[PDB]
C-alpha cells in the first residue's frame, strides 16, 4: 500500500462561554431507522464516523430524506467564527483566455479532510432503536460534516496548502479553487495540457483526493453562477421575466434583481421606474400598478433582452477603456472594453437620494464606482471616455468648494453632453441693478410675504399662503430673478438659500429651486451677496415682509 | 527578547475589518514584502480558525521608489487596552527646528505576545477574487500598532540615554513609528547631528515650528469703501463677534442705510471709523479663555480656498481655536485636489502630533466616495487619523481668507 500523506487538522473551539449542543433526538419511522442504520454502517465502514460510548453528553438530531441529514444548526450557533475567503465571486470579464481548460470536481470533498479530534465529541448524534427498546446507537464524526459551519473554510485552506507546491512548480498553468471544484487552464498544446492535468490529479491523489477519471463530465459551454462561459466569450444565462397582470412587492424585487443581473453585459438597461414602487416595503403581498414610464421601460428591457449579447475575456497587453453616457433621470450607463464594439462588460449607475444635484457630481460618482469595480475585476483603473468638455471640468473643479478628482480621461463627443448650466460672479457687477430681497412667514398661520427693493426704486411684496421662512426666502430671490435684466446683483440674508445655490444644482426636487435654476440659466451675469439679518443693514428690509 | 503580556479592553473582541481592493502592482509589492518578512520570522501564515482581519496596503515614502507596507491598525488600536503615561514635551513645539525619523525597523527585533498574535491578522487580497487571499499574522511588534511604542519605551530610553545625557538641549519625543528631535542648531549642524543620532541608532524632513504660529483676524484697510465692501466687512465682523465679545457693527451698518448700488462708494463717518478701529484693537488681542483639555478630542476643519491654497483650524470647543493655519505648498499636485487635501491632512496631523501628542478628527471638504477611492494613493505617513465628511458648503470660507 502506497503511504498517503496526512492532512493536518485545524484546531477548532466553540464560542467563549458556550458548551456543546444538547438537542433531543426525533422519533423516526422503522423504515427511516433501518435506512439510517445501513447508511451509518457503510459510513463507519468507510471511516467517516465512529461509534462512541455513553460518556458523550452532546447530541445532534438526525433525519432521513434514503439520504442521511444531520441538523447542525445548534452546533453552528455554538461554533466559533471562521474566515471565509468566499466574499464576492470572480467576474468572467476578469478571466484571461486559455487555449485549454479543464474542470476537476473533488468527490467526497468534506469527507476526505479529517476533523480536529478534540472537537469531534461535539458532533455526536444518535440513531433511535426500533420501538426504543434498546439504547440508540451513538456516533461521532471523524471528518468535516457537510452542513457544519467550519467545513468550507477548512476544506478550502487544506486544498490550498496541498495545491501550493504543484502550482509553484507549474508557473505555466493557472489553477482556481471554488467550492467543491477546481478549474485549471493553460495555453500549452492540448496534449501537454492533458498531461499536466494527469500530473495534477496524481499529485492530488498522493493526499487521498479523487478527480473525475472519465472524460471530465463538464465541457464548454460551462454554466456557472448565472453565467455562460464559452471558449472565446462569456455571457449571462438567458433571462426569465414573468408576465402577470397583478404584481406583488416580491415579484418586483425578483424582476429588479433579474434586470440588474442582465445589465452587466446588456447595455442600456433601466430599472428606475420599477424601483420607485419599492417605497414602503416589508409587505411582500400587494398589488402595485405600473405607470406608462414603467411599462415603456419594461418594454424597452424586453427589447434589449430580445437578442443575445456576449462579452469578451480580458487581455492584459491592451489598454482598459471605460465610456460613460447620460441616460436621464439620474441614470447613467457605461461600457468597459479594450477594442471597439467588443465589451469586456457593461453596467449602470443611479444617482443617490438627495434634495438637489447636478450632472457633474453624478458623473464623478459614476467614475468612482467604475474605478472601484475595475480595481476589483482587473486590478487597475481604466482610461475614461466622458461626455464632458475639458474646459467644463476645469471650470467645475477649479471653482468647486469641495475637493474632487477624476483619473486620466478624454472627452468623447456623444450627446447629451454634461455641462455647467450657470456660473455666479465673484465680484459685484457695475451697471447692474441691485435687488435687496427678503421673505418671512408666520409659524402658526403659515402666512408669509416675499419681495425686494432695488436701487432704482423698483419694489415688490407678494403675499403667500401655506409657506415657511425658507420658502419665502427662495421665493424672494426668484422674484428678483423674474423682474430683473440679464445682469443683476442680489442681496439676501438667507443662509439657507445661499447654501442651496452655492452647492450649484442643475435639478432639484423643490419646484421653487428648479424655477430659480431656470432663471439663472437665462441670465448673463448674477452676483449673489449675503448679509447678516436684523443688523440694521439698510436696504435689506425685514420689516417690509413682516407686515 | 522577553514577551510582555498584552490583552484587550474588557468586553471587546478582535478587529474584523474588510480588506479593500488593491491594484495589481500594490498586491505584487505586498506579496514580495510579506514573503521576505516570512523568511525573517516577522510574520507567519495562518489558517481559517482566525476570523480577525486588519486592512493592509502599500505606499511609497518621500525620496524613495521602494514600496512600503502600511497596516490600518486604527480599529485594533482603539480596541487595544490603554497602555500607561509620559507627559507630552511642551517644549518640542517651542524649539527652533524638529526632525522626524522612522524608527519602525527597531520594532521588528522585539517578539510579540503569543496569545495576542491572532489579533494582528491581515489579508493580501487577490485580483477578481480568483484565489484565496494570503493571510498572515505578526510574530514581532508590528509597525502602526499603538502598543509597539509603549512596549519599546524602556528599550528606546536605554538606547537614547547616552545621547540625552550628551545634549540636554535636544528634545526627544516619540509617536508611533516616528521619533521627533527638536533643537536650536544650524541646518548644517542639525543635519550632522541627525546623522550622528541615526548612526547611534544604527549600531544599536526639516520642520521648523518657529516659522509657524497662530493667525489673527485682519480687516481691510481702504481709502474708499463700496456698499459691497462694507457689507462683507459687517458680515465678517458679525462672524468674529462669536469669537470676540466686544465686536460691534451698528455704526458700520448705519452707513448701509438705503437701497444703494453695490459698487457705489460710501464715505465712512467718524463714528464708523471709530467702531472699525475699536474692532481692530479687539481683534489684535488673543481669544478669551482658550485652554487645552487632554480628555477631549481635537477637531480639525479644512477649507479649500482655490489655487492650491487651503485653510485649517484645530479646536476643541467651537470658536475656541487652539491652532489656525494656511497650507499653500505646491509640490507636484497642481492638477489634483485630492492629493493636495491628503498632503494637507498629513501636515496638519504632524503639527497636531508635535503640539499635543495626538491626532485630531478631521472634517474633510470632500465626498466620502472620492476620498475613500483615492486617499491611499498619496499617503506617505505611518499613522492614520480619523475623518468625517462635510457635505454642506460652509459660509465661513472667505472669512478665513
Ligand atoms: C473552466 C473555468 C475557468 O477556466 C479557467 C481556468 C484557469 C485559468 C483561466 C480559465 O478561464 C479563462 C477564460 N475561459 C473560460 C472558459 C473557457 O472555455 N475558456 C477560457 O479561456 C474559470 C472559471 C472562473 C472562476 C473559477 C474562477 C470557471 C468557473 C466555473 C466553471 C464551471 N462549471 C468553469 C470555469
What is the DSSP track for A190-253?
A: HHHHHHHHHHHHHHHHTTT-B---SS-S--SSEEETTEEE-SS-EEEPPP-----SS--HHHHH
- In a shared domain, residues A390 and A324: yes
A388 HSE (CA, 13 A, CB side) = 26
Mutate to test the pocket of ligand 1, among A95, A173, A182 (most ligand atoms within 8 A of CB): A95
- In a shared domain, residues A518 and A448: yes
CB atoms within 10 A of CB B109: 12
Regarding the beta carbon of A257 and ligand 1, being less than 6 Å apart is answered no
Is B132 close to A405, i.e. CB distance below 8 A?
Answer: no
Q: Within the 409-468 window of chain A, which residues sit less than 8 Å (CB to CB) from chain B?
A: 427-430, 433-434, 436, 453-455
- In a shared domain, residues A491 and A481: yes
Interstrand relation of B265-266 and B225-226 (parallel, antiparallel or unpaired): antiparallel
DSSP codes joined into one string, A75-87 = HHHHBPP-----S
d(CA A492, CA A185): 69
Dmax over CA atoms of chain A, in Å, equals 109
Interstrand relation of A100-105 and A181-186 (parallel, antiparallel or unpaired): antiparallel
Residue with cell 476589483: A376
- In a shared domain, residues A427 and A505: yes
- In a shared domain, residues A328 and A415: yes
Cβ neighbourhood burial of A19 (10 Å; 0-12, 13-18, 19+): exposed
Angle at B155 between CA B150 and CA B161, to 5 degrees: 115
Cell of B378: 498619496
- B328, B318, B288, B343: which is closest to B394 by C-alpha? B318
- A209, A206, A189: which is closest to A100 by C-alpha? A189
DSSP codes joined into one string, B54-79 = B-EEEE--TT--S-EEEE-THHHHHH
Residue with cell 496526512: A6
Task: With beta carbons less than 8 A apart as the criterion, state whether A432 and A485 touch.
Answer: yes
d(CA B73, CA A198): 45
The structural domain count of chain A equals: 5
- DSSP conformational letter for B378: S
d(CA A184, CA B153): 52
- B341, B334, B121, B106: which is closest to A403 by C-alpha? B341
Facing residue for B128 by CB, picked from A94, A535, A539: A94
Residue A529 forms contact with B (CB below 8 Å): yes
Is A375 close to B22, i.e. CB distance below 8 A?
Answer: yes
CB neighbour list of residue B256: distance below 8 Å, 6 or more residues apart: A536, A537, A538, A539, B227, B230, B231, B234, B266
Residue A365 forms contact with B (CB below 8 Å): yes
- In a shared domain, residues A342 and A367: yes
Closest ligand 1 atom, CA of B129?
A: 27
d(CA B268, CA B272): 6
**Phi, psi at B45, each rounded to 5°:** -70, 155
Residue A47 forms contact with B (CB below 8 Å): no
Nearest chain B residue to A381 by CA distance is B23
d(CA B395, CA B390): 12
- B173, B216, B208, B159: which is closest to B187 by C-alpha? B208
- In a shared domain, residues A241 and A192: no
SS3 state of residue A437: strand
Q: Among residues A372, A388, A421, which one ends one of the domains?
A: A421
Is A398 close to B306, i.e. CB distance below 8 A?
Answer: yes
Q: At what angle do helices A469-482 and A511-521 cross, to 10 degrees?
A: 20
**Phi, psi at A513, each rounded to 5°:** -60, -40
d(CA A134, CA A128): 9
- In a shared domain, residues A138 and A185: no
CB neighbour list of residue B22: distance below 8 Å, 6 or more residues apart: A375, A379, B30, B57, B58, B125
- Partner residues linked to B323 by β-bridges: B314
Nearest chain B residue to A175 by CA distance is B131
- In a shared domain, residues A40 and A75: yes
Strand runs labelled E in B225-308? 225-226, 265-266, 299-306
Would the annotation count B169 as a binding residue?
A: no
- In a shared domain, residues A17 and A127: yes
Instruction: Provide the H-helix boundaries in B4-83.
Output: 24-39, 74-79
Q: Which domain holds residue A288?
A: 221-314
Task: Write out chain A residues lying below 8 Å of B364, CB-based.
Answer: 403
- In a shared domain, residues A93 and A195: yes
Q: Which helix (H) or strand (E) holds A518?
A: helix A511-521
Is B365 close to A403, i.e. CB distance below 8 A?
Answer: yes
- DSSP conformational letter for B377: G
Question: Nearest C-alpha of chain B: how many angstroms from A58?
Answer: 22
SS3 state of residue B24: helix
- Partner residues linked to B16 by β-bridges: B53
Closest ligand 1 atom, CA of A178?
A: 26
Task: With beta carbons less than 8 A apart as the criterion, state whether B340 and B333 touch.
Answer: yes
Is B260 close to A10, i.e. CB distance below 8 A?
Answer: no
Nearest Cα residue to atom 22 of ligand 1: A183
Interstrand relation of A181-186 and A173-178 (parallel, antiparallel or unpaired): antiparallel
SS3 state of residue B385: coil
- Checking chain B for breaks where C and the next N are over 2.5 Å apart, the residues before them are 84, 204
B128 backbone φψ class: left, alpha, beta (φ>0; ψ -120 to 50): left
CB neighbour list of residue A259: distance below 8 Å, 6 or more residues apart: A241, A269, A271, A274, A301
Stated resolution in angstroms:
2.7
Q: Among residues A199, A220, A241, which one ends one of the domains?
A: A220
- In a shared domain, residues A496 and A414: no
Cell of B229: 465692501
Task: With beta carbons less than 8 A apart as the criterion, state whether B316 and B296 touch.
Answer: yes
Strand runs labelled E in B218-359? 225-226, 265-266, 299-306, 309-315, 321-327
Task: Compute CA B23 distance to the chain's CA centroid, rounded to the nearest angstrom.
Answer: 26
Residue with cell 419665502: A472
Question: Nearest C-alpha of chain B: how many angstroms from A400?
Answer: 8
Question: What b/e sequence results for B353-386 when a residue is b if at least 16 CB atoms lie within 10 Å of its CB, and e otherwise?
Answer: bbbbbebbebbbbbbebbbebbbbbbbebbbbbe
- The answer to whether the Cα torsion of B197, B199, B202, B205 is positive or negative is positive
**Phi, psi at B306, each rounded to 5°:** 90, 155
Would the annotation count A493 as a binding residue?
A: yes
Facing residue for A502 by CB, picked from B226, B254, B393: B393
d(CA B149, CA B152): 5
Regarding the beta carbon of A336 and ligand 1, being less than 6 Å apart is answered no
- DSSP conformational letter for B93: T
Task: Write out chain A residues lying below 8 Å of B13, CB-based.
Answer: none
Nearest chain B residue to A398 by CA distance is B306
Facing residue for A495 by CB, picked from B48, B366, B395: B395
- Domain spans of chain B? 5-90+116-156, 91-115+157-206, 207-292, 293-401
Nearest Cα residue to atom 14 of ligand 1: A97
Q: Among residues A267, A289, A314, which one ends one of the domains?
A: A314
- Partner residues linked to A453 by β-bridges: A436, A459
Residue with cell 498619496: B378
d(CA A27, CA A80): 30
Is A429 close to B131, i.e. CB distance below 8 A?
Answer: no
d(CA B387, CA B361): 5
d(CA B382, CA B394): 31
What is the rounded (10 degree) CA torsion for B366, B368, B372, B373?
-80
Is A150 close to B48, i.e. CB distance below 8 A?
Answer: yes
Amino acid at each position: 500500500m502506497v503511504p498517503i500523506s496526512p492532512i493536518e487538522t485545524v484546531p477548532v473551539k466553540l464560542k467563549p462561554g458556550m458548551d456543546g449542543p444538547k438537542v433531543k433526538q426525533w422519533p423516526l419511522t422503522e423504515e427511516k431507522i433501518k435506512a439510517l442504520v445501513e447508511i451509518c454502517t457503510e459510513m463507519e465502514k468507510e471511516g467517516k464516523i465512529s461509534k462512541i460510548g455513553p460518556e458523550n453528553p452532546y447530541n445532534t438530531p438526525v433525519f432521513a430524506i434514503w439520504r442521511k441529514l444531520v441538523d447542525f444548526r445548534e452546533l453552528n450557533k455554538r461554533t466559533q467564527d471562521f474566515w471565509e475567503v468566499q466574499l464576492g465571486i470572480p467576474h468572467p470579464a476578469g478571466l484571461k483566455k486559455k487555449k485549454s481548460v479543464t474542470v476537476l470536481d473533488v468527490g467526497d470533498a468534506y469527507f476526505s479532510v479529517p476533523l480536529d479530534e478534540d472537537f469531534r465529541k461535539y458532533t455526536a448524534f444518535t440513531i433511535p432503536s426500533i420501538n426504543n427498546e434498546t439504547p440508540g446507537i451513538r456516533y461521532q464524526y471523524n471528518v468535516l460534516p457537510q452542513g457544519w459551519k467550519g467545513s468550507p473554510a477548512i476544506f478550502q485552506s487544506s486544498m490550498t496548502k496541498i495545491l501550493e507546491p504543484f502550482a509553484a512548480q507549474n508557473p505555466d498553468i493557472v489553477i482556481y479553487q471554488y467550492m467543491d471544484d477546481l478549474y485549471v487552464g493553460s495555453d500549452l498544446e492540448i496534449g501537454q495540457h492533458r498531461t499536466k492535468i494527469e500530473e495534477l490529479r496524481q499529485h492530488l491523489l498522493r493526499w487521498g483526493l479523487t478527480t473525475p477519471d472519465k472524460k471530465h463530465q463538464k465541457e464548454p459551454p460551462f454554466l456557472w453562477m448565472g453565467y455562460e462561459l464559452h471558449p472565446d466569450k462569456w455571457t449571462v444565462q438567458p433571462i426569465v421575466l414573468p408576465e402577470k397582470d397583478s404584481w406583488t412587492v416580491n415579484d418586483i424585487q425578483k424582476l429588479v434583481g433579474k434586470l440588474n443581473w442582465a445589465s452587466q453585459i446588456y447595455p442600456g438597461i433601466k430599472v428606475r421606474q420599477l424601483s420607485k414602487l419599492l417605497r414602503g416595503t416589508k409587505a411582500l403581498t400587494e398589488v402595485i400598478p405600473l405607470t406608462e414610464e414603467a411599462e415603456l421601460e419594461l418594454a424597452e428591457n424586453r427589447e434589449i433582452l430580445k437578442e443575445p449579447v456576449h462579452g469578451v475575456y480580458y487581455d492584459p497587453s491592451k489598454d482598459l477603456i471605460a465610456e460613460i453616457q447620460k441616460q436621464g433621470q439620474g441614470q447613467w450607463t457605461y461600457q468597459i472594453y479594450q477594442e471597439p464594439f467588443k465589451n469586456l462588460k457593461t453596467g449602470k449607475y443611479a444617482r443617490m437620494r438627495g434634495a438637489h444635484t447636478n450632472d457633474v457630481k453624478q458623473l464623478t460618482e459614476a467614475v468612482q464606482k467604475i474605478t472601484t469595480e475595475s480595481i476589483v475585476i482587473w486590478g487597475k483603473t481604466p482610461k475614461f471616455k466622458l461626455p464632458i468638455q475639458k474646459e467644463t471640468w476645469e471650470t467645475w473643479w477649479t471653482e468647486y468648494w469641495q475637493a474632487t478628482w477624476i483619473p486620466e480621461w478624454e472627452f468623447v463627443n456623444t450627446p447629451p453632453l454634461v455641462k455647467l448650466w450657470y456660473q455666479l460672479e465673484k465680484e459685484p457687477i457695475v451697471g447692474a441693478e441691485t435687488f435687496y430681497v427678503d421673505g418671512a412667514a408666520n409659524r402658526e398661520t403659515k402666512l408669509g410675504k416675499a419681495g425686494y427693493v432695488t436701487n432704482k426704486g423698483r419694489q415688490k411684496v407678494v403675499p403667500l399662503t401655506n409657506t415657511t421662512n425658507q420658502k419665502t426666502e427662495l421665493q424672494a430671490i426668484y422674484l428678483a430673478l423674474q423682474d430683473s435684466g440679464l445682469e443683476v446683483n442680489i442681496v439676501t440674508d438667507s443662509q439657507y438659500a445661499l447654501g442651496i445655490i452655492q452647492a450649484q444644482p442643475d435639478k432639484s426636487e423643490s419646484e421653487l429651486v428648479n424655477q430659480i435654476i431656470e432663471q439663472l440659466i437665462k441670465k448673463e451675469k448674477v452676483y449673489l451677496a449675503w448679509v447678516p439679518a436684523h443688523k440694521g443693514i439698510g436696504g435689506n428690509e425685514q420689516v417690509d415682509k413682516l407686515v | 527578547i522577553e514577551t510582555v503580556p498584552v490583552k484587550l479592553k474588557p468586553g471587546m473582541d478582535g478587529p474584523k475589518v474588510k480588506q479593500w481592493p488593491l491594484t495589481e502592482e500594490k498586491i505584487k509589492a505586498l506579496v514580495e514584502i510579506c514573503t521576505e518578512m516570512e523568511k525573517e520570522g516577522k510574520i507567519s501564515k495562518i489558517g481559517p480558525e482566525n476570523p480577525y482581519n486588519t486592512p493592509v496596503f502599500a505606499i511609497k515614502k518621500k525620496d524613495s521608489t521602494k514600496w512600503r507596507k502600511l497596516v490600518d491598525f486604527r480599529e485594533l488600536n482603539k480596541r487595544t487596552q490603554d497602555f500607561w503615561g509620559i507627559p507630552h514635551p511642551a517644549g518640542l513645539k517651542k524649539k527652533k527646528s524638529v526632525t522626524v525619523l522612522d524608527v519602525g525597523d527597531a520594532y521588528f527585533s522585539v517578539p510579540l505576545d503569543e496569545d495576542f498574535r491572532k489579533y494582528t491578522a491581515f489579508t493580501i487580497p487577490s485580483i477578481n477574487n480568483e484565489t484565496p487571499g494570503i493571510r498572515y499574522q505578526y510574530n514581532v511588534l508590528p509597525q502602526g500598532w499603538k502598543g509597539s511604542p509603549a512596549i519599546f519605551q524602556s528599550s528606546m530610553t536605554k538606547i537614547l540615554e547616552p545621547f540625552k545625557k550628551q545634549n540636554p538641549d535636544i528634545v526627544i519625543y516619540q509617536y508611533m513609528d516616528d521619533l521627533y528631535v527638536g533643537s536650536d542648531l544650524e541646518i548644517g549642524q542639525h543635519r550632522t547631528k541627525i546623522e550622528e543620532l541615526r548612526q547611534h541608532l544604527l549600531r544599536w524632513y526639516e520642520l521648523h515650528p518657529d516659522k509657524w504660529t497662530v493667525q489673527p483676524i485682519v480687516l481691510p484697510e481702504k481709502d474708499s469703501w463700496t456698499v459691497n465692501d462694507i457689507q462683507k466687512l459687517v458680515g465678517k465682523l458679525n462672524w468674529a463677534s462669536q469669537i470676540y465679545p466686544g465686536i460691534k457693527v451698528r455704526q458700520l451698518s448705519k452707513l448701509l442705510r438705503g437701497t444703494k448700488a453695490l459698487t457705489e462708494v460710501i464715505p465712512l463717518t467718524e463714528e464708523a471709523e471709530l467702531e472699525l478701529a475699536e474692532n481692530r484693537e479687539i481683534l489684535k488681542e488673543p481669544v478669551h479663555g482658550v485652554y487645552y483639555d487632554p480628555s477631549k478630542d481635537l477637531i480639525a476643519e479644512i477649507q479649500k480656498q482655490g489655487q492650491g491654497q487651503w485653510t485649517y483650524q484645530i479646536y476643541q470647543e467651537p470658536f475656541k481655536n487652539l491652532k489656525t493655519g494656511k497650507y499653500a505648498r505646491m509640490r507636484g499636485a497642481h492638477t489634483n485636489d485630492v492629493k493636495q487635501l491628503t498632503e494637507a491632512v498629513q501636515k496638519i496631523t504632524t503639527e497636531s502630533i508635535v503640539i499635543w501628542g495626538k491626532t485630531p478628527k478631521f472634517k474633510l471638504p470632500i465626498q466620502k466616495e472620492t476620498w475613500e477611492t483615492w486617499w491611499t494613493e498619496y499617503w506617505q505617513a505611518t499613522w492614520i487619523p480619523e475623518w468625517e465628511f462635510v457635505n454642506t458648503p460652509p459660509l465661513v470660507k472667505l472669512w478665513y481668507q
